[PDB]
Write a structure and sequence with these properties.
seven-stranded mixed beta sheet, about 45% helix, 2 domains, 8 helices, binds ligand A1H20, alpha/beta, binds zinc ion, Leucine Aminopeptidase, subunit E, domain 1
């Protein structure tokens, strides 16, 4: 009969355990049981899975998505021209496309429960995301360079597409080279160019390179804003709304000062 919420969750865990030959007792709460699935999903290198698993995975995750506090693009009220500014979780936002800050293998994040945007996006979207990116890397025959863009379905997310870009990474101790500036520009240009070719009306960016890859937050923002404006000045595009989705208070405050002059 109709497997309810707990019965679906408890199925999926057992599946991934039995494919790695073990079993640990199922924790008490819903919350701890939920993190075990995340953990098992994050850790699973790409390969075939049963259509039964996908179907049920999709029912479970779509439901979770539908029960969050979703935000529509037309409901963001802070805007300057086609640019909007918004603080919130990119997995709650109904844009045509969201941008993922990814790595050169484009497989997402293998640490259980890490809070990088790559893990967060793959954990809400589903295993199909890793599988689709893996088919694209295999056909390309080679890792993805910094500053390009690739597009995929968004699966159980509330958006339609995900755009994957790999930003530059700043070694601990070193200052930012003119070459690193140019590469982070190219991330923004590639993502705009791709969404333009797909004729999308809205895209949401995260603050690429500013977490694990350790780019200074203020300098990143000056670049992101100048690049987006030069692109909108210089091209025709179907884009009406380009959303800087910021996650930390400090990035909110940085972006707010530079866009809305105090
Ligand atoms: N929900 C959210 N919505 C909006 N913005 C958010 C959200 N959450 C965070 N964010 C924000 O997204 C921005 C992007 O930060 P970020 O660290 O995700 O990305 P970054 O571009 O600076 O770095 C990307 C790299 O690290 C990952 N890799 C790992 O984590 C692997 C590891 N080093 C290993 O040893 O195994 C990933 O595969 C790639 O390799 C930040 O401003 C957060 O506040
Ligand atoms: Zn509109
Ligand atoms: Zn991570
Ligand atoms: Zn193209």
């Amino acid at each position: 009969g109709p497997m309810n919420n707990d019965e679906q969750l408890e199925f999926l865990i057992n599946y991934l355990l039995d494919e790695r030959s073990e079993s640990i007792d199922i924790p008490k709460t819903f919350s701890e049981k939920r993190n075990l699935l995340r953990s098992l999903m994050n850790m699973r290198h790409p390969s075939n899975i049963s259509e039964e698993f996908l179907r049920i995975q999709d029912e479970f995750l779509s439901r979770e998505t539908a029960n969050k506090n979703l935000t529509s693009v037309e409901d963001i009220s802070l805007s300057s021209g086609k640019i909007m500014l918004w603080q919130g979780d990119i997995t709650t936002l109904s844009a045509d496309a969201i941008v993922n800050a990814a790595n050169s293998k484009l497989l997402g994040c293998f640490i259980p429960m890490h809070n990088c945007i790559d893990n967060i996006i793959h954990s809400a979207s589903g295993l199909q995301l890793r599988e689709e990116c893996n088919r694209m890397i295999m056909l390309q025959g080679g890792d993805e360079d910094v500053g390009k863009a690739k597009i995929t379905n968004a699966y159980n997310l509330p958006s339609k597409y995900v755009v994957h870009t790999v930003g530059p990474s700043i070694e601990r101790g070193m200052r930012v080279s003119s070459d690193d500036v140019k590469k982070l520009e190219r991330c923004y240009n590639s993502c705009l160019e791709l969404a333009s070719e797909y004729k999308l009306n809205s895209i949401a960016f995260c603050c690429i390179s500013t977490g694990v890859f350790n780019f200074p937050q203020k300098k990143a923002a000056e670049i992101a804003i100048r690049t987006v404006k030069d692109f909108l000045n210089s091209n025709e595009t179907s884009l009406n709304h380009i959303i800087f989705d910021v996650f930390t208070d400090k990035d909110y405050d940085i972006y707010k000062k530079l866009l809305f002059g105090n």
